[PDB]
Design a protein around this ligand. Structure first.
Ligand SMILES: NC(=O)c1ccc[n+]([C@@H]2O[C@H](COP(=O)([O-])OP(=O)(O)OC[C@H]3O[C@@H](n4cnc5c(N)ncnc54)[C@H](OP(=O)(O)O)[C@@H]3O)[C@@H](O)[C@H]2O)c1
Length: 310
């Protein structure tokens, strides 16, 4: 019907698949752009059975992108770090088509316009800033989503629930606060804000009050959930900083990110600005899965661990 048509790049991705599923769940005609050689064949079949329109192609096919843009209203990019500046190909097609009502670049993490990080990670978020600056310069309608930490991703990374070990690694003192959200909710909320007038040309942050915690508190709550105590092993901050300077790339990127998220506490080190929009306050019919509900999920049916591409 009146539902905006949504085109998602990187839809077969770790977070992208949740945006595809949320888009379809909300009744939006959904287009998924994917490479001809992608191994996500079974996932594509699932998308297809859910109503998605699969489009195979490369980002280098400018004409194809333009003709595709002319058929949709909203464009969301969930591309990975190595493809951040490749989004300029998406933006060029958007500019040529001229009918796009909203573009969401691949941010979905920290709010890069108000935080800085160590060189390895700073270089990456600067690329995301470059995309943002280009969007504004071209007057393209946008929404910048700061989804903070992907919950399943980091519960797996921090607690290694699938590991029967008696020790757990803590980064820094472990007292830095961070916010983490369930991937499925990040996906649904993202589709929602992409058509919400309240999010037009604004920064949207996912910071539900029920999802703020520290490494130490997360460990304590997990210990209570499973009835086991862990020996906490700390990795000194000065130690983490040194590694980012000596280790080769991309090996030093994960370390820099851990410092930003769990030592500097970048997702919780600022207060909201006047024009910021905190997503959990937008829809009374929805709510973000809480940390306690997440831990229960890991007790009953834990999702597999993942590792971002660098
Ligand atoms: N906040 C957090 O905790 C957190 C954690 C992880 C990631 N992130 C962010 O989430 C966003 C997406 O990350 P992700 O881990 O979901 O991405 P991903 O799964 O690694 O990749 C997304 C998609 O990119 C496409 N792709 C891969 N290589 C490509 C290439 N050479 N050329 C063109 N397309 C290519 C693939 O789709 P096809 O195979 O269909 O072509 C892939 O499924 C990024 O902005 C990332 O920084 C945030």
């Amino acid at each position: 019907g009146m539902k905006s048509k949504i085109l998602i790049f990187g839809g077969t991705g770790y977070i992208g698949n949740h945006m595809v599923k949320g888009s379809l769940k909300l009744g939006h005609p959904t287009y998924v752009f994917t490479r001809p050689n992608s191994s996500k064949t079974t996932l594509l079949d699932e998308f297809q059975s859910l109503g998605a329109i699969i489009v195979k192609g490369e980002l280098d096919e400018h004409e194809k992108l333009v003709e595709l843009m002319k058929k949709v209203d909203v464009v969301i990019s969930a591309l990975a770090f190595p493809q951040i500046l490749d989004q300029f190909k998406i933006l060029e097609a958007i500019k040529v088509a001229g009918n796009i009502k909203r573009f969401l670049p691949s941010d979905f993490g920290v709010e890069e316009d108000r935080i800085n990080a160590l060189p390895p990670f700073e270089a990456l978020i600067e690329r995301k800033r470059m995309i943002r600056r280009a969007i504004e310069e071209a007057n393209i309608p946008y929404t910048y989503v700061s989804a903070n930490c992907f919950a399943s991703y980091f519960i797996n990374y921090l607690l290694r629930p699938y590991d029967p070990k008696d020790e757990i690694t803590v980064y820094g003192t472990g007292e830095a606060k961070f916010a983490m959200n369930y991937e499925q909710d990040i996906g649904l909320y993202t589709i929602k804000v992409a058509t919400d007038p309240r999010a037009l040309n604004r920064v949207v942050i996912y910071r539900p009050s029920t999802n703020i915690i520290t490494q130490l508190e997360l460990i304590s709550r997990w210990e209570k959930k499973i009835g086991k105590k862990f020996k906490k092993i700390h990795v000194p901050e000065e130690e983490i900083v040194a590694l980012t300077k000596e280790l080769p790339e991309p090996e030093n990127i994960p370390i820099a990110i851990l410092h930003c998220l769990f030592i500097d506490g970048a997702t919780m080190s600022y207060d909201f600005k006047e024009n910021d929009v905190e997503a959990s306050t937008l829809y009374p019919e929805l709510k973000f899965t809480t940390i306690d509900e997440l831990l229960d999920i890991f007790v009953h049916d834990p999702p597999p661990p993942a590792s971002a591409a660098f």
